[PDB]
Amino acid sequence: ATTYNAVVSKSSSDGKTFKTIADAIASAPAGSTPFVILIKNGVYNERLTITRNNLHLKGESRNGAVIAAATAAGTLKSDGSKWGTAGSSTITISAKDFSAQSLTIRNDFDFPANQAKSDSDSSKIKDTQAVALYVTKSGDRAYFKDVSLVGYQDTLYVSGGRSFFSDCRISGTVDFIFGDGTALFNNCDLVSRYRADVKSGNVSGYLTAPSTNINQKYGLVITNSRVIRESDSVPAKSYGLGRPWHPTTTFSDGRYADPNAIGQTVFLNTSMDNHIYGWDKMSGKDKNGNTIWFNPEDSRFFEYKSYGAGATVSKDRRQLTDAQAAEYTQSKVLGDWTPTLP
Numbered sequence: 001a002t003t004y005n006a007v008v009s010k011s012s013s014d015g016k017t018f019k020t021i022a023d024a025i026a027s028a029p030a031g032s033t034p035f036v037i038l039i040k041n042g043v044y045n046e047r048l049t050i051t052r053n054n055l056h057l058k059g060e061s062r063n064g065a066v067i068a069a070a071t072a073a074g075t076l077k078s079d080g081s082k083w084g085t086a087g088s089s090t091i092t093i094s095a096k097d098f099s100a101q102s103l104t105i106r107n108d109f110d111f112p113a114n115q116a117k118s119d120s121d122s123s124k125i126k127d128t129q130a131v132a133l134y135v136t137k138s139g140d141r142a143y144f145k146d147v148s149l150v151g152y153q154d155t156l157y158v159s160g161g162r163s164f165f166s167d168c169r170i171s172g173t174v175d176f177i178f179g180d181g182t183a184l185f186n187n188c189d190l191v192s193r194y195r196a197d198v199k200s201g202n203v204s205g206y207l208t209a210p211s212t213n214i215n216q217k218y219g220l221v222i223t224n225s226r227v228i229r230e231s232d233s234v235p236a237k238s239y240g241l242g243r244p245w246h247p248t249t250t251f252s253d254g255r256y257a258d259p260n261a262i263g264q265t266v267f268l269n270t271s272m273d274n275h276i277y278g279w280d281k282m283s284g285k286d287k288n289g290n291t292i293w294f295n296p297e298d299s300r301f302f303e304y305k306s307y308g309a310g311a312t313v314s315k316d317r318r319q320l321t322d323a324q325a326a327e328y329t330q331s332k333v334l335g336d337w338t339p340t341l342p
């Protein structure tokens, strides 16, 4: 009995359909009853901040139903101030029990074109993070099935609660899955993108930059997935599996890189092409204003039965025991939440 409460389409000759996704959401009755919106094939140039609990979007197809906007952290608003990383997001989830199925969410910020600009070009943005999807601390129990997330730097920002990504595609360059949330990814393609601006021998990017608090049991958990390159031009040993993001945070003794954001990234039964070289470090500013490096060996970076050309086992790539791997089942990672579609 999978009926829809609202239908969005590009055709006016469709029937009683909404022209925009924002207008379909608007039609939802107030409160927390389930509301399911069908989004017909088309490119919808909208930015959305979801504040209604129990909201569910279903695209006609992942290939054809697209929600897209172009905004970098360094893009200026009317008041001439920056959007910032969080502010750059095409879709922001600030409610509970959200789901999206069979659709694509993009940030269309043209990172390569930006990088190709002359250094003296005043329109060349330095703050190049451009978030496609941001699940916030108010967005617990967010479920994405057969969803594609497109971007370069900082594609997916996962913060606070639990999220589950299933049969998904996520693409990017630098820290394209990042944040402190519990985010489980199963049967996903994680696509490392070509970088025209990066010299031969230098690092093109990092799949993950977790900021998971040390007292949180689960961070970024990747299972039964495929870590792939976008093209043959993506060089061997050009991408890190993760680096430790210790976010700039305000404390009683000043504002600096969070010492306790000791991120977790775990890969289980995941294929990796040879663009992967291993884990890496990341720098921030400490309480004194000095550079401080956060090292992968000090972080919760683990693999279990990786395979494919990028799957080396070495001292620098710690491996879970079978008994440790059993701790990373969906049931354990997501606790009392079983992701379900309406």
Ligand SMILES: O=C(O)[C@H]1O[C@H](O[C@@H]2[C@H](O)[C@@H](O)[C@@H](O[C@@H]3[C@H](O)[C@@H](O)[C@@H](O[C@@H]4[C@H](O)[C@@H](O)[C@@H](O[C@@H]5[C@H](O)[C@@H](O)[C@@H](O[C@@H]6[C@H](O)[C@@H](O)[C@@H](O)O[C@@H]6C(=O)O)O[C@@H]5C(=O)O)O[C@@H]4C(=O)O)O[C@@H]3C(=O)O)O[C@@H]2C(=O)O)[C@H](O)[C@@H](O)[C@H]1O
Residues within 6 Å of the ligand: 084, 085, 086, 087, 128, 129, 153, 154, 174, 175, 178, 203, 209, 246, 247, 248, 249, 282, 283, 284
């Ligand atoms: O509590 C809140 O909710 C909070 O929310 C806001 O905040 C968030 C965040 O919580 C804040 O801490 C802060 O975050 C900063 C930034 O916005 C965020 O994306 C992230 O950034 C990472 C690095 O710290 C940045 O320096 C930057 O990385 C650069 C390059 O951009 C990147 O390409 C790459 O570079 C390569 C090599 O790897 C380098 O070695 C070198 O050779 O250069 C090349 C190259 O240029 O190609 O890595 C470097 C680097 O490592 O420095 O981007 C990183 C990223 O993840 O993309 O963390 C920042 C930080 O910790 O300060 O702001 C966030 C925001 O939304 O603005 C509110 O603002 C806050 O008040 C509060 O409310």
